[PDB]
Amino acid sequence: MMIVIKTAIPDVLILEPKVFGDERGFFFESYNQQTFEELIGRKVTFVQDNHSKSKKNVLRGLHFQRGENAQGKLVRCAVGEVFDVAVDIRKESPTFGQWVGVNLSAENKRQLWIPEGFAHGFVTLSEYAEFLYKATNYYSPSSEGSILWNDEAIGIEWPFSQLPELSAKDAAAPLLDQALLTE
Amino acid sequence: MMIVIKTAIPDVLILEPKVFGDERGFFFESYNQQTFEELIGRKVTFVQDNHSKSKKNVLRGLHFQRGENAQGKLVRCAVGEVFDVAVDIRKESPTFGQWVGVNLSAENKRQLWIPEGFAHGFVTLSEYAEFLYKATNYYSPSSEGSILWNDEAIGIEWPFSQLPELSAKDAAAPLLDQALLTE
Numbered sequence: 377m378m379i380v381i382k383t384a385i386p387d388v389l390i391l392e393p394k395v396f397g398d399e400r401g402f403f404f405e406s407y408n409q410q411t412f413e414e415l416i417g418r419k420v421t422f423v424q425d426n427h428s429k430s431k432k433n434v435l436r437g438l439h440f441q442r443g444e445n446a447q448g449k450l451v452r453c454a455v456g457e458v459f460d461v462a463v464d465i466r467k468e469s470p471t472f473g474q475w476v477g478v479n480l481s482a483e484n485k486r487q488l489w490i491p492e493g494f495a496h497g498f499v500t501l502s503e504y505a506e507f508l509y510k511a512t513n514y515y516s517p518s519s520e521g522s523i524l525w526n527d528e529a530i531g532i533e534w535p536f537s538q539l540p541e542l543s544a545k546d547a548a549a550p551l552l553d554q555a556l557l558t559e
Numbered sequence: 560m561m562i563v564i565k566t567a568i569p570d571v572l573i574l575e576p577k578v579f580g581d582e583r584g585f586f587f588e589s590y591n592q593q594t595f596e597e598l599i600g601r602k603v604t605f606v607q608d609n610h611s612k613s614k615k616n617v618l619r620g621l622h623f624q625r626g627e628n629a630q631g632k633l634v635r636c637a638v639g640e641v642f643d644v645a646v647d648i649r650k651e652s653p654t655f656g657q658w659v660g661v662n663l664s665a666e667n668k669r670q671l672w673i674p675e676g677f678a679h680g681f682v683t684l685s686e687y688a689e690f691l692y693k694a695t696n697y698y699s700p701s702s703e704g705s706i707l708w709n710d711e712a713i714g715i716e717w718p719f720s721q722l723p724e725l726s727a728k729d730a731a732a733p734l735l736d737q738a739l740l741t742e
């Protein structure tokens with residue numbers, strides 16, 4: 377079965393499957409279309425599944441895709457553990473600029489549903505972490521947008537102390553207001 | 560580039576996704592709706608993602624769902640390695656009773672596309688293996704059918720050199736001529 381926990385931000389949900397465990401090992405539906413739609417209240421189609429691997433402390437900057445290319449993302453961690461973050465970047469939203477952070481691990485099997493209109497990011501807490509997620513729309517380079525991980529206006533409280541290992545592009549990410557200039 | 564390898568049985572395809580990076584930091588699309596559809600030539604919708612964990616030698620399988628509940632399955636291995644098998648069980652098929660076996664590992668990132676009309680099974684080769692897959696239709700116990708792993712009519716050549724561990728349900732599977740293939 378799966379427990380659905382609401383977060384401080386309405387549209388952002390934490391999902392916690394409980395697995396059917398036995399001698400072989402375990403089995404669980406990590407996703408079920410019908411179930412998810414009733415749970416979200418709207419039809420939603422995931423067209424792309426991504427899988428990544430990161431070393432401890434690697435933080436994948438805050439990302440999002442603009443307008444029609446915005447991606448809703450249902451993310452989970454298949455190996456290791458990460459601290460996952462969703463930031464509301466809808467200018468007209470009551471929770472604009474607010475963030476939600478959740479520990480997602482292969483062990484706890486938590487998933488975080490991040491609707492279109494949010495920026496996403498995560499840091500690897502384990503030696504290595506393998507991150508999996510489903511997106512409601514296709515990857516579109518021309519639509520990419522980013523926000524610096526430690527932006528003060530959002531003020532995310534990241535679980536680490538050291539400076540994160542960042543990609544060229546995330547280290548050079550704009551601040552919240554700059555990033556959303558034309559949005 | 561992404562590779563699609565045809566097997567001895569026409570409709571069964573091996574997919575090897577385009578992978579960026581090495582095995583200490585990578586990223587790949589494990590699924591892409593548009594890409595898969597043009598690849599198969601027909602529209603295909605996956606409504607369920609399943610995730611399982613098995614210990615070495617656990618053989619799960621020779622499962623299928625009948626008629627309208629038949630599931631097309633796109634399978635891969637996110638942790639460890641398994642020997643995956645697809646068996647053609649379409650009575651009117653030229654390849655009826657034939658099987659295809661492929662090693663799927665976290666490392667090689669291969670995926671096997673098994674259309675409706677096939678029975679599926681796999682054995683865990685690593686200490687533990689985490690198997691992931693997408694199904695085109697929902698789980699349907701009343702529609703489910705099974706076939707004993709060592710059925711002689713099919714004659715699968717299993718890799719393990721030791722007796723497989725089977726759930727009680729699979730240990731009780733019938734032989735091909737007794738399997739409930741239709742209705």
Ligand SMILES: CC(=O)O[C@H]1C[C@H](n2cc(C)c(=O)[nH]c2=O)O[C@@H]1COP(=O)(O)OP(=O)(O)Oc1ccccc1
Pocket residue numbers: 396398403404405609697698726727728729
């Ligand atoms: C109580 C319980 O164990 O529920 C089952 C059925 C469930 N399941 C299984 C599949 C294949 C699916 O798509 N969805 C789903 O919810 O996952 C569990 C594992 O199913 P399984 O077929 O892998 O294994 P089983 O050998 O223990 O036989 C059982 C099957 C049904 C009920 C009880 C036992």
Ligand SMILES: CC(=O)O[C@H]1C[C@H](n2cc(C)c(=O)[nH]c2=O)O[C@@H]1COP(=O)(O)OP(=O)(O)O
Pocket residue numbers: 426428436437439515543544545546579586588
């Ligand atoms: C890692 C993640 O969770 O999402 C990534 C990767 C994703 N992407 C990336 C590529 C290269 C592709 O073909 N498809 C695709 O969906 O688009 C996002 C941006 O990847 P990026 O490689 O363009 O930039 P980066 O330096 O910030 O990684």
